Amino acid sequence: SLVKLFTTNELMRWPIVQKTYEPVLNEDDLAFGGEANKHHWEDLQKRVIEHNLRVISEYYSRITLLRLNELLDLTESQTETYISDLVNQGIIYAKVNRPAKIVNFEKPKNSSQLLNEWSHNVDELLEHIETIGHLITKEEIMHGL
Amino acid sequence: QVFDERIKFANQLHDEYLVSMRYPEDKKTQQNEK
Amino acid sequence: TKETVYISSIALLKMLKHGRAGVPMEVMGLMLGEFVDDYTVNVVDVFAMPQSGTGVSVEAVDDVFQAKMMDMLKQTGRDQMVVGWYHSHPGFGCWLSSVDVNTQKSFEQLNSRAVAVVVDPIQSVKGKVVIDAFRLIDTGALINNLEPRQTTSNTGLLNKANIQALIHGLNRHYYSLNIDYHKTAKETKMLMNLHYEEKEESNLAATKSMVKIAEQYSKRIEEEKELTEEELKTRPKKHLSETADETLENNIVSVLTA
Amino acid sequence: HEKVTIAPLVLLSALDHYERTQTKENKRCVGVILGDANSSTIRVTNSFALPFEEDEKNSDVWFLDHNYIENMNEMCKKINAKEKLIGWYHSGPKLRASDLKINELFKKYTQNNPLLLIVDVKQQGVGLPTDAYVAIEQEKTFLHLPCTIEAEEAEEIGVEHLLRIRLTNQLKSLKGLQSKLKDVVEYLDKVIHTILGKLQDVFNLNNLQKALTVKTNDELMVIYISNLVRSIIAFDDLIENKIQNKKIQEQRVKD
Amino acid sequence: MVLEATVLVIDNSEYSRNGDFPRTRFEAQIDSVEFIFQAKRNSNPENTVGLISGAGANPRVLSTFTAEFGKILAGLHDTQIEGKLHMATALQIAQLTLKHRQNKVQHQRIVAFVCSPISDSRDELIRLAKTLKKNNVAVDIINFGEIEQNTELLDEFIAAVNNPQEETSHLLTVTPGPRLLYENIASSPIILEEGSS
Amino acid sequence: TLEPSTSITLAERQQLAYDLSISALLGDKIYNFGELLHHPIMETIVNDSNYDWLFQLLNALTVGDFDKFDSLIKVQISKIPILAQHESFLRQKICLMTLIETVFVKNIRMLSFEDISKATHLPKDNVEHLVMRAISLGLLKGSIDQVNELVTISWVQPRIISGDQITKMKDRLVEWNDQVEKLGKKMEAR
């Protein structure tokens, strides 16, 4: 059930469960056998931050630093630390605007890319026109009954 | 709007090119040659 | 002499498809239609005979399989009897062999109006089908010596060698003919279907060129620059004019998308 | 999706059977197609006909010959062994409700999903009105596939022998708009389901085309720039010919 | 007797699915087809016998005219024994089936076994009998237990096509007395004066 | 398969409706009450003996009064933890789809926070959360901008069973057919 929450992750209820229910987290038997509570939670908090930043990058076009810190439950230094690391890895590209205190997640597109996606829609509209065109004869059985 | 006039100016000399070049070749056809 | 032999538009497409079975393997198939006196051979429908390892011989014809198929064609709307058969001679000209003479002679007692057609699909790739026919003699217009086959016109003998030497001397199993095709008003638009189904393909090619509009013109301009230096170092125009033609087709058509 | 290709041999075969079977009073002629459906592009290289008689006032009476199915096996298999039965075709402009029961008869002979081919004999359409449908499990629906023309030495030779841009598309776009317009008029008169679901797909996906106008004209001027550098080259093929023609004239004067 | 085409129709309905014959009559009706097939096949060396099942499966064409029983027996096991018997659409499609024969000079004959009363109206049978009379179509009606729990709905069809026994309009009724399966058609003018019985 | 055969009596129909009434109410997949009005479900049962709360659900979801849901569902039902989370999920989806057709004029589907907050009586913190969950499920495409206070929502839901836009989209096809015909005649002249 947590796998389907990757896209819907709000980060709100995750630390509540992360501090309460840890069936496979801090207790390992048939795989790792267990090491320590800090070792299993060392990389855990780093990934949960990555799950939220991927959602915001695919949803929020721009968001203020005051609200972004409340959604990540971090400070100003810890917020830009994980965001800037994902930029160098070639995953999330986001322009942080310090004067406006916002982070722009919209990636720039050239004139050819905007016209290319418009061409896919024109070819898509012809598919709906063609599909409906053949549905008149197919649904004529019920209309002509 | 300016680019449209450049096509009009290019095709303007194309029609006049056939008129100026072909006209002097009319007399060489009727005149007897060796 | 010459006459007019009409062939339906559907019969020509089937004979070319039957001759595609193989180049070295000769094919033979029957035909259907009617006649007008002795000067008109009407070819309407054609039949596809099974292959035989004897190379189209007199013993390669099966009357049992023929009688079973022709009886089934009556339910399909065919009221016409067999007007003859076509035999493909790929790679050679139009001529009759010693086997075709003995084979066509066996059908003289069955149908004296039968026609032996020689089609050459190999030399037909030029856009005009090279084809010739040969018909037996039912007489009635001839008897001993007369002049049948009205309206001698169009081309001459041509063909290749053997059947050209004798025309009026021996008319029995071979003589020259002409080929004619008669199409109706409805059959004109049947072949016009090659060119909103195709409208979607027009904008589909524009979609791929929409992102490539920068890459397409990049190769055209750099090519015109290299061809310009070759014209300056000549002191040519044929290779330069070919590039400008492709640019014209990539411009006006691209404007039509708007 | 897959592709369907109908050869002009199959086209003229289905269109000629209209006057051969004496089909009139808005009837249909049921044929059969032969092709290879194993690949992604369905190509029909052979076709035949079947007797079909259906009453106008009774849709439960139809005649079909199943004995001719076994007769082509004794013929085609002795010439082309790769020909199999992938379905059938119809000569009617639009399909009827009887085609659902026809699939039960040919499902035993066909080794794959039968193909439903529709060929318009009136030739009242633009381009290629011939359409193809594939019956799958919906109960059952017909999936449409685009139809092309077979390009081969066995066809184009006969086509070129017998016979010998945007303006054409403008008349094609009118057919798609008038088809949906007349469907709404006939719907409102008969009342006061799949069309209503897909209808708003076009409206929400041409006022929306004006937002990219700023970015649309960016690449439009490049076309004129490409024509500007080409226009100068156009004179290079002209003036050069004028110089060559002038030298020819100088040789004719001395003659 | 002479050269003729025979079209056979099998009856599959709710009464055929219920208790009918101790051998599972649907399987015995398959033997009933074998009884008339062996009689007509031994009469002439060339015969055309068709098979059409229009009861409960909607009008269909199973097998065309053939002189062998191999493909006829295999197609009957894949049919359905449920539904209702409709003779209105079954007899109309059989007229076009008569044209499937090779030589049109053959006598047109239709032999149908009706084990259950039809629910269809009798208005379509009036205009159908007058059409079959002009083409001289032999009508063979075998009614099994139909006259007990219901009247004869095919009587109006026979009255319009009514002709002396030398041509057409032959109406028969299965004897209610218990007897062998092949003996029911032996006394009736069906397999009489044929190759076998 | 229950209507054609296999115990077509109303005894099995009333028992089957108990399963659909609980599933369609809690189900967040296809609308809420949309599938109930199309298929004749409620028409096969009676209005009494604890079947009344199914008919009153139509007016409760259409109006949107929060006080109606308290008296409609008693403690013998809502005690399940599933409905406790879905108690606020019923009014968020209907009011969200209602604002789409209301603001839509020609090209503008854009919304704002004040239109969503006043409709659902929810704070701005839940506007970017509860609506975002419906977007991730495939109901909507566009997202919400927290900075400029603008909500840009695309069109996804086909909005089945409308009937009002049929007369409106009729003139749209005439307008499209006239613009193409006007430009098509100029192609023949030049």
PDB file of C-alpha atoms in Angstrom, chain A:
ATOM      1  CA  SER A   1       0.000   0.000   0.000  1.00  0.00           C
ATOM      2  CA  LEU A   2       2.975   2.318   0.545  1.00  0.00           C
ATOM      3  CA  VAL A   3       4.089   1.722  -3.057  1.00  0.00           C
ATOM      4  CA  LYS A   4       0.927   3.335  -4.446  1.00  0.00           C
ATOM      5  CA  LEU A   5       1.596   6.275  -2.092  1.00  0.00           C
ATOM      6  CA  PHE A   6       4.780   7.277  -3.950  1.00  0.00           C
ATOM      7  CA  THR A   7       2.841   9.605  -6.262  1.00  0.00           C
ATOM      8  CA  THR A   8       0.323  10.709  -3.606  1.00  0.00           C
ATOM      9  CA  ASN A   9       2.961  11.274  -0.902  1.00  0.00           C
ATOM     10  CA  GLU A  10       2.130  14.373   1.147  1.00  0.00           C
ATOM     11  CA  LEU A  11       4.900  13.655   3.738  1.00  0.00           C
ATOM     12  CA  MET A  12       2.292  14.458   6.427  1.00  0.00           C
ATOM     13  CA  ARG A  13       1.616  10.975   7.834  1.00  0.00           C
ATOM     14  CA  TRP A  14       4.983   9.403   6.955  1.00  0.00           C
ATOM     15  CA  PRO A  15       7.005  10.499  10.043  1.00  0.00           C
ATOM     16  CA  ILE A  16       4.028   9.516  12.211  1.00  0.00           C
ATOM     17  CA  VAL A  17       4.347   5.923  10.994  1.00  0.00           C
ATOM     18  CA  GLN A  18       8.139   6.229  10.699  1.00  0.00           C
ATOM     19  CA  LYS A  19       8.238   6.959  14.450  1.00  0.00           C
ATOM     20  CA  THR A  20       5.592   4.364  15.380  1.00  0.00           C
ATOM     21  CA  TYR A  21       5.179   1.340  13.075  1.00  0.00           C
ATOM     22  CA  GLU A  22       8.467  -0.179  11.858  1.00  0.00           C
ATOM     23  CA  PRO A  23       7.695  -3.841  11.076  1.00  0.00           C
ATOM     24  CA  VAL A  24      10.279  -4.220   8.282  1.00  0.00           C
ATOM     25  CA  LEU A  25      12.213  -1.032   9.093  1.00  0.00           C
ATOM     26  CA  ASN A  26      14.234  -1.476  12.298  1.00  0.00           C
ATOM     27  CA  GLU A  27      13.563  -5.240  12.558  1.00  0.00           C
ATOM     28  CA  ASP A  28      15.093  -7.580   9.970  1.00  0.00           C
ATOM     29  CA  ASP A  29      15.109 -11.373  10.150  1.00  0.00           C
ATOM     30  CA  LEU A  30      15.309 -13.288   6.864  1.00  0.00           C
ATOM     31  CA  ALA A  31      17.340 -10.716   4.910  1.00  0.00           C
ATOM     32  CA  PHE A  32      19.631  -8.331   6.801  1.00  0.00           C
ATOM     33  CA  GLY A  33      19.128  -9.904  10.236  1.00  0.00           C
ATOM     34  CA  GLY A  34      19.193  -6.374  11.695  1.00  0.00           C
ATOM     35  CA  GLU A  35      21.997  -3.924  12.382  1.00  0.00           C
ATOM     36  CA  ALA A  36      20.943  -0.805  14.292  1.00  0.00           C
ATOM     37  CA  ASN A  37      18.026   1.594  14.557  1.00  0.00           C
ATOM     38  CA  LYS A  38      20.127   4.475  13.203  1.00  0.00           C
ATOM     39  CA  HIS A  39      21.617   2.532  10.279  1.00  0.00           C
ATOM     40  CA  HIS A  40      18.219   1.512   8.891  1.00  0.00           C
ATOM     41  CA  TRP A  41      16.872   5.054   9.382  1.00  0.00           C
ATOM     42  CA  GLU A  42      19.979   6.812   8.027  1.00  0.00           C
ATOM     43  CA  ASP A  43      19.099   6.376   4.345  1.00  0.00           C
ATOM     44  CA  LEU A  44      15.364   6.087   5.079  1.00  0.00           C
ATOM     45  CA  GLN A  45      14.875   9.800   5.772  1.00  0.00           C
ATOM     46  CA  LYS A  46      16.915  10.680   2.675  1.00  0.00           C
ATOM     47  CA  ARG A  47      14.628   8.639   0.413  1.00  0.00           C
ATOM     48  CA  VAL A  48      11.373   9.987   1.884  1.00  0.00           C
ATOM     49  CA  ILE A  49      12.589  13.480   0.982  1.00  0.00           C
ATOM     50  CA  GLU A  50      13.249  12.239  -2.558  1.00  0.00           C
ATOM     51  CA  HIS A  51       9.715  10.832  -2.811  1.00  0.00           C
ATOM     52  CA  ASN A  52       8.213  14.239  -1.988  1.00  0.00           C
ATOM     53  CA  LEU A  53      10.474  16.272  -4.289  1.00  0.00           C
ATOM     54  CA  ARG A  54       9.515  14.046  -7.225  1.00  0.00           C
ATOM     55  CA  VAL A  55       5.816  14.713  -6.579  1.00  0.00           C
ATOM     56  CA  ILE A  56       6.252  18.485  -6.269  1.00  0.00           C
ATOM     57  CA  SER A  57       8.396  18.587  -9.415  1.00  0.00           C
ATOM     58  CA  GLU A  58       5.651  16.718 -11.300  1.00  0.00           C
ATOM     59  CA  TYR A  59       2.826  18.772  -9.755  1.00  0.00           C
ATOM     60  CA  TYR A  60       3.748  22.207  -8.397  1.00  0.00           C
ATOM     61  CA  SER A  61       5.109  24.520 -11.083  1.00  0.00           C
ATOM     62  CA  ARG A  62       6.331  26.971  -8.433  1.00  0.00           C
ATOM     63  CA  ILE A  63       6.029  27.076  -4.646  1.00  0.00           C
ATOM     64  CA  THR A  64       7.226  29.479  -1.967  1.00  0.00           C
ATOM     65  CA  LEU A  65      10.081  28.567   0.360  1.00  0.00           C
ATOM     66  CA  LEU A  66       7.848  29.118   3.399  1.00  0.00           C
ATOM     67  CA  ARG A  67       5.363  26.500   2.182  1.00  0.00           C
ATOM     68  CA  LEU A  68       8.042  24.180   0.769  1.00  0.00           C
ATOM     69  CA  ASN A  69       9.742  24.038   4.175  1.00  0.00           C
ATOM     70  CA  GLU A  70       6.423  23.156   5.829  1.00  0.00           C
ATOM     71  CA  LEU A  71       5.810  20.340   3.336  1.00  0.00           C
ATOM     72  CA  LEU A  72       9.341  18.941   3.733  1.00  0.00           C
ATOM     73  CA  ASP A  73       9.469  19.560   7.522  1.00  0.00           C
ATOM     74  CA  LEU A  74      13.019  20.907   7.187  1.00  0.00           C
ATOM     75  CA  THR A  75      14.919  24.179   7.510  1.00  0.00           C
ATOM     76  CA  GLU A  76      16.142  26.486   4.740  1.00  0.00           C
ATOM     77  CA  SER A  77      19.588  24.869   4.592  1.00  0.00           C
ATOM     78  CA  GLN A  78      18.265  21.294   4.619  1.00  0.00           C
ATOM     79  CA  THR A  79      15.699  22.095   1.910  1.00  0.00           C
ATOM     80  CA  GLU A  80      18.159  23.279  -0.751  1.00  0.00           C
ATOM     81  CA  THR A  81      20.598  20.480   0.141  1.00  0.00           C
ATOM     82  CA  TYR A  82      18.534  17.580  -1.215  1.00  0.00           C
ATOM     83  CA  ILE A  83      17.052  19.613  -4.083  1.00  0.00           C
ATOM     84  CA  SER A  84      20.433  20.687  -5.468  1.00  0.00           C
ATOM     85  CA  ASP A  85      21.790  17.127  -5.241  1.00  0.00           C
ATOM     86  CA  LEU A  86      19.046  15.765  -7.505  1.00  0.00           C
ATOM     87  CA  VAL A  87      19.844  18.418 -10.129  1.00  0.00           C
ATOM     88  CA  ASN A  88      23.410  17.163 -10.611  1.00  0.00           C
ATOM     89  CA  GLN A  89      22.137  13.575 -10.924  1.00  0.00           C
ATOM     90  CA  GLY A  90      19.929  14.476 -13.899  1.00  0.00           C
ATOM     91  CA  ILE A  91      16.572  13.725 -12.280  1.00  0.00           C
ATOM     92  CA  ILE A  92      14.790  16.921 -11.195  1.00  0.00           C
ATOM     93  CA  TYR A  93      15.525  20.302 -12.797  1.00  0.00           C
ATOM     94  CA  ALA A  94      14.140  23.199 -10.752  1.00  0.00           C
ATOM     95  CA  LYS A  95      15.055  26.893 -10.807  1.00  0.00           C
ATOM     96  CA  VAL A  96      15.176  28.281  -7.262  1.00  0.00           C
ATOM     97  CA  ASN A  97      14.274  31.982  -7.127  1.00  0.00           C
ATOM     98  CA  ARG A  98      15.754  33.491  -3.962  1.00  0.00           C
ATOM     99  CA  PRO A  99      14.404  37.085  -4.313  1.00  0.00           C
ATOM    100  CA  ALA A 100      10.873  35.769  -4.848  1.00  0.00           C
ATOM    101  CA  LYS A 101      11.545  33.020  -2.254  1.00  0.00           C
ATOM    102  CA  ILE A 102      10.076  30.449  -4.659  1.00  0.00           C
ATOM    103  CA  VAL A 103      11.317  27.399  -6.563  1.00  0.00           C
ATOM    104  CA  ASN A 104      10.254  27.105 -10.208  1.00  0.00           C
ATOM    105  CA  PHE A 105       9.848  23.461 -11.242  1.00  0.00           C
ATOM    106  CA  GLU A 106       8.863  24.211 -14.856  1.00  0.00           C
ATOM    107  CA  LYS A 107      11.614  23.225 -17.283  1.00  0.00           C
ATOM    108  CA  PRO A 108      12.170  25.540 -20.272  1.00  0.00           C
ATOM    109  CA  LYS A 109      11.104  24.364 -23.718  1.00  0.00           C
ATOM    110  CA  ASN A 110      12.155  25.646 -27.132  1.00  0.00           C
ATOM    111  CA  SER A 111       9.802  26.771 -29.893  1.00  0.00           C
ATOM    112  CA  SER A 112      10.134  23.459 -31.750  1.00  0.00           C
ATOM    113  CA  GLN A 113       9.184  21.413 -28.678  1.00  0.00           C
ATOM    114  CA  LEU A 114       6.010  23.432 -28.088  1.00  0.00           C
ATOM    115  CA  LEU A 115       4.972  23.086 -31.737  1.00  0.00           C
ATOM    116  CA  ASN A 116       5.826  19.371 -31.754  1.00  0.00           C
ATOM    117  CA  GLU A 117       3.445  18.573 -28.892  1.00  0.00           C
ATOM    118  CA  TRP A 118       0.828  20.652 -30.715  1.00  0.00           C
ATOM    119  CA  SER A 119       1.305  18.396 -33.749  1.00  0.00           C
ATOM    120  CA  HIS A 120       0.613  15.289 -31.655  1.00  0.00           C
ATOM    121  CA  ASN A 121      -2.705  16.833 -30.596  1.00  0.00           C
ATOM    122  CA  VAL A 122      -3.697  17.543 -34.210  1.00  0.00           C
ATOM    123  CA  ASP A 123      -3.015  13.909 -35.104  1.00  0.00           C
ATOM    124  CA  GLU A 124      -4.899  12.906 -31.948  1.00  0.00           C
ATOM    125  CA  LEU A 125      -7.955  14.969 -32.912  1.00  0.00           C
ATOM    126  CA  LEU A 126      -8.039  13.170 -36.265  1.00  0.00           C
ATOM    127  CA  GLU A 127      -8.147   9.874 -34.358  1.00  0.00           C
ATOM    128  CA  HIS A 128     -11.245  10.950 -32.421  1.00  0.00           C
ATOM    129  CA  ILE A 129     -12.867  12.248 -35.615  1.00  0.00           C
ATOM    130  CA  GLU A 130     -12.123   8.934 -37.335  1.00  0.00           C
ATOM    131  CA  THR A 131     -13.287   6.875 -34.346  1.00  0.00           C
ATOM    132  CA  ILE A 132     -16.612   8.710 -34.013  1.00  0.00           C
ATOM    133  CA  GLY A 133     -17.034   8.519 -37.788  1.00  0.00           C
ATOM    134  CA  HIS A 134     -17.112   4.722 -37.632  1.00  0.00           C
ATOM    135  CA  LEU A 135     -19.318   4.698 -34.515  1.00  0.00           C
ATOM    136  CA  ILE A 136     -22.278   6.130 -36.452  1.00  0.00           C
ATOM    137  CA  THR A 137     -22.534   2.942 -38.517  1.00  0.00           C
ATOM    138  CA  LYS A 138     -21.772   0.727 -35.510  1.00  0.00           C
ATOM    139  CA  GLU A 139     -24.471   2.375 -33.373  1.00  0.00           C
ATOM    140  CA  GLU A 140     -26.917   2.471 -36.303  1.00  0.00           C
ATOM    141  CA  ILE A 141     -28.150  -0.967 -35.186  1.00  0.00           C
ATOM    142  CA  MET A 142     -29.602   0.488 -31.983  1.00  0.00           C
ATOM    143  CA  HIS A 143     -30.762   3.714 -33.648  1.00  0.00           C
ATOM    144  CA  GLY A 144     -32.228   1.971 -36.702  1.00  0.00           C
ATOM    145  CA  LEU A 145     -33.959  -0.763 -34.688  1.00  0.00           C
TER     146      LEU A 145
END
